[PDB]
């Protein structure tokens with residue numbers, strides 16, 4: 001059985017790096033992370049000093 | 065990194081109050097709740113004495 | 129077996145009340161109304177004296 | 193010919209009032225506003241003192 | 257308040273049995289599982305000895 | 321001209337059998353049923369003694 | 385309150401004429417038809433002597 | 449950089465002609481119109497003497 | 513077993529004729545074309561002398 | 577690089593078996609079939625002696 | 641009240657840089673740009689000497 | 705007439721490079737590749753030594 005968690009990663013460099021930021025966090029806390037699916041991408045402009053790319057991912061991990 | 069949880073709040077008064085019901089529950093248990101996105105709305109009619117409005121929300125919170 | 133009818137209710141007060149307007153009509157004519165799912169919301173501005181909120185719902189009822 | 197503008201209204205009271213906030217702004221600046229379609233709803237929690245409901249609408253107006 | 261978890265169950269027999277596999281796992285770990293909504297179906301062919309049907313479900317459970 | 325009715329069939333056995341349950345009901349009451357399109361699938365867990373699979377279908381029938 | 389019926393009209397001439405075919409049928413049987421929304425378009429090629437255009441519409445009519 | 453405007457054209461003849469009606473209006477007021485994407489089609493029946501076809505288009509134009 | 517190919521037909525006359533243009537091409541090269549489903553419509557304005565309507569279709573054909 | 581082909585399988589028994597029917601055909605003609613994603617399900621009722629379940633799948637295969 | 645404009649940025653380097661190209665243009669002409677949401681990505685191959693990545697964004701800005 | 709093929713490219717570097725990987729393969733085998741539309745993005749984590757970005761594209765090419 002796989003479970004997914006819905007995470008938004010952020011990066012000041014790129015959408016790819018924002019995806020990685022989310023996946024890195026998942027791997028810090030979860031065992032057996034297997035894949036991720038991109039579900040949204042965006043850019044924060046007003047609340048930040050530097051534009052921040054965001055990529056939201058469903059991160060799948062195998063239970064047991 | 066933000067994480068979202070998918071919650072359905074309920075209210076006998078309104079769709080807004082049902083959203084609040086979900087958000088209230090998130091804030092009881094989670095730190096750093098930042099926003100919520102409505103993903104569905106419905107009304108329970110048959111299994112209840114009074115019509116119950118429901119609003120399903122992705123509730124986002126900041127990790128760390 | 130459940131069947132759904134696709135109804136648009138209207139209200140000069142709110143989206144919740146417009147949903148109720150549709151559900152009320154369903155209950156006038158149908159037995160065993162069980163739930164409703166919101167599928168669209170809108171506001172009529174030009175053809176009306178007062179802004180009219182509309183909520184379109186699939187209203188489910190149990191056959192037999 | 194109708195044209196639509198994509199506006200997000202806000203309210204500390206309700207999703208209906210947030211829709212109105214967007215429509216009010218459209219009517220301040222545009223002639224012949226005819227209808228609005230809700231396309232998204234959300235709640236701002238972290239960046240505000242009071243929860244703020246938001247309703248995003250396509251607001252249609254008649255050209256000429 | 258209901259919460260949903262997004263689970264992918266698997267089966268070498270059928271899509272129905274894959275849904276059950278996910279629901280069984282939810283019921284092992286959660287109290288008050290109430291319903292599930294199918295959100296995706298697929299078949300694993302290359303990484304397996306026997307074709308494996310998968311059904312991804314949002315599994316809803318009542319909080320408290 | 322074809323017309324569709326939106327029916328949810330149920331079964332304690334499978335999603336296929338739940339589709340059939342809806343189609344059977346349509347054929348009891350309508351002439352000239354021609355096809356059905358699956359639009360949703362779900363499982364009722366809490367309100368039932370045995371898990372009940374549901375399949376919602378648009379059932380098309382030829383008018384005249 | 386408006387209600388919609390989901391009709392597929394057909395024509396050997398065009399998608400517009402297929403929409404009209406559905407609307408004509410609605411107006412034969414229903415009072416107060418107000419609008420229609422196109423939801424799908426297709427072409428039947430194999431089961432027919434001449435290609436047949438089809439347009440599926442939600443046809444809205446005012447109740448009472 | 450391209451920008452899109454969301455226009456609904458109308459015609460008493462066809463969906464194609466309604467698309468053209470929107471595009472014509474865009475070309476009256478904008479330089480460098482390059483393409484249009486159909487996003488919705490509908491028919492106005494009740495508020496008009498003759499059925500009026502409508503086609504909503506995103507009309508893209510090149511900035512600078 | 514049916515297979516679909518995703519084709520974009522073009523016409524300087526109409527969306528219907530653009531669909532036909534795609535279907536004609538499919539029938540030139542494939543046996544047993546049975547139906548087509550419209551998936552997108554657009555208009556090319558800038559790269560052409562005359563506006564060109566386009567209709568993208570999944571064209572289904574029976575294998576064997 | 578993976579490529580997908582869009583196939584509709586059929587079965588007089590079940591949606592699972594209809595998926596298999598499509599996948600079987602892909603494996604007859606293609607090397608390195610790896611997975612399939614269900615994209616639609618339906619039932620043919622009028623043109624057949626026995627109800628025929630159909631499952632449409634994107635079947636992915638590895639190029640080279 | 642926020643308003644969104646729908647812009648397609650382009651880049652010969654990456655999808656991230658194409659998003660930036662759109663956002664840069666918005667910031668040249670608009671005050672109070674706050675965020676952007678990616679709605680589509682594509683690559684122009686035939687009409688260009690070098691492949692050109694495109695990213696279409698809704699760019700939100702605060703009115704007043 | 706344009707035809708599209710649905711390809712998933714892969715890269716250990718970025719989503720842009722994964723799109724290119726798919727487009728490169730299309731250009732190896734097809735004449736007159738004109739554009740590509742991104743339809744999905746994902747990351748393979750478990751079955752690989754290094755995270756592999758994937759971008760799925762519809763690649764359009766002109767027939768004849």
Ligand SMILES: [Cl-]
Nearest residue numbers: 198454646698
């Ligand atoms: Cl828009």
Ligand SMILES: [Cl-]
Nearest residue numbers: 006058070262
């Ligand atoms: Cl989710």
Ligand SMILES: [Cl-]
Nearest residue numbers: 134186326390
């Ligand atoms: Cl419907």
Ligand SMILES: [Cl-]
Nearest residue numbers: 518570582710
């Ligand atoms: Cl496809």
Ligand SMILES: [Mg+2]
Nearest residue numbers: 011012013050
């Ligand atoms: Mg930096």
Ligand SMILES: [Mg+2]
Nearest residue numbers: 040041042056
């Ligand atoms: Mg988002």
Ligand SMILES: [Mg+2]
Nearest residue numbers: 075076077114
């Ligand atoms: Mg009360």
Ligand SMILES: [Mg+2]
Nearest residue numbers: 104105106120
């Ligand atoms: Mg729901």
Ligand SMILES: [Mg+2]
Nearest residue numbers: 139140141178
């Ligand atoms: Mg009042």
Ligand SMILES: [Mg+2]
Nearest residue numbers: 168169170184
């Ligand atoms: Mg509507």
Ligand SMILES: [Mg+2]
Nearest residue numbers: 203204205242
């Ligand atoms: Mg207050």
Ligand SMILES: [Mg+2]
Nearest residue numbers: 232233234248
């Ligand atoms: Mg939003």
Ligand SMILES: [Mg+2]
Nearest residue numbers: 267268269306
């Ligand atoms: Mg077995």
Ligand SMILES: [Mg+2]
Nearest residue numbers: 296297298312
């Ligand atoms: Mg999936």
Ligand SMILES: [Mg+2]
Nearest residue numbers: 331332333370
């Ligand atoms: Mg049993």
Ligand SMILES: [Mg+2]
Nearest residue numbers: 360361362376
């Ligand atoms: Mg449902």
